[PDB]
Paper text:
Cyclotides are a large family of topologically unique peptides characterized by a head-to-tail cyclic backbone and three interlocked disulfide bonds. This combination of structural features forms a cyclic cystine knot (CCK) motif and confers cyclotides exceptional stability. Cyclotides are divided into three subfamilies: bracelet, Möbius, and trypsin inhibitor subfamilies. Since cyclotides were first reported two decades ago, studies on bracelet cyclotides have been hampered by their low synthetic yields because of poor oxidative folding efficiency.
Therefore, d-enantiomers of [I11L]cyO2 and [I11L]hD were chemically synthesized and used for quasi-racemic crystallization to determine structures of cyO2 and hyen D. The mirror-image symmetry of d-[I11L]cyO2 with l-cyO2 and d-[I11L]hD with l-hyen D was confirmed using circular dichroism (CD). The crystal structure of the quasi-racemate of wild-type cyO2 was solved in space group P1 21 1 at 1.17 Å resolution. The structure of cyO2 displays a small α-helix centered in loop 3 and a triple-strand β-sheet located in loops 4, 5, and 6. The inset of Figure 3b shows the disulfide connectivity of cyO2 is well defined by the electron density and confirms it forms the cystine knot topology, the structure of which is key to the ultrastability of cyclotides. Overall, the structure of cyO2 determined here using crystallography is similar to the solution structure previously determined by NMR spectroscopy, validating the quasi-racemic crystallography approach for structure elucidation of bracelet cyclotides. To gain more insight into the differences between bracelet and Möbius cyclotides and why they might have different folding yields, the crystal structures of cyO2 and kB1 were compared. Between the two peptides, the hydrogen bond network exhibited differences. Specifically, kB1 has more hydrogen bonds between different loops. We note, in particular, the hydrogen bond between Val-10 (loop 2) and Trp-23 (loop 5), for which an equivalent hydrogen bond to connect loop 2 to 5 is not present in cyO2.
Author numbering:
A (entry chain A), B (entry chain B): 1 to 30
The structure:
Amino acid sequence: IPCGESCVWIPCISSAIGCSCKSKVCYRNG
Amino acid sequence: XXXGXXXXXXXXXXXXXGXXXXXXXXXXXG
């Protein structure tokens, strides 16, 4: 699930809620 | 959790499946 953040320029700040960079977009659980 | 990247100036490399890092990203258990 996309978390509302991309990660081309900079890693995912949404890592704080468990999201991570996949294919340019921050996701958790698809 | 984590698992997207991070490092804070190196580190990571996925931990070869095992995660790593901490404050600066990585993941694993968390």
